């Protein structure tokens, strides 16, 4: 029971946990996912329709469905953005990722 391994499981689990049986996320599933899993993020998102904007971008979002792969896109987008900000602006104690996502906004 490794640690990267848990992280990956979390990721898989979360997608599936919110997606449910149908296998994909609709804009609604995704909004709640982000409401629970990225608490302050979406709130501090100063566009109030950021979810719409994010949904509209998602690689395969065109049938309104959101694949795991698409879902992963999002994780990559956030993580990598987090990391870039982390390295430039700071370079342990938890609660930082949480604090970085706060300053993050879409294109």
């Amino acid at each position: 029971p490794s640690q990267m391994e848990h992280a990956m499981e979390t990721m898989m689990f979360t997608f599936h946990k919110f997606a449910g049986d149908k296998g994909y996320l609709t804009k609604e599933d995704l909004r709640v996912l982000m409401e629970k899993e990225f608490p302050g993020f979406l709130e501090n998102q100063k566009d109030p329709l950021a979810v719409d904007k994010i949904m509209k971008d998602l690689d395969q979002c065109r049938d309104g469905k959101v694949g795991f792969q698409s879902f992963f896109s999002l994780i990559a987008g956030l993580t990598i953005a987090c990391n870039d900000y982390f390295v430039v602006h700071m370079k342990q104690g938890d609660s930082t990722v949480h604090e970085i996502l706060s300053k993050l906004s879409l294109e």
Binding site: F72, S73, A76, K103, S105
Partner: peptide
Amino acid sequence: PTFFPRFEF
């Protein structure tokens, strides 16, 4: 081969 979205700030 996947395309992700870009977050700044």
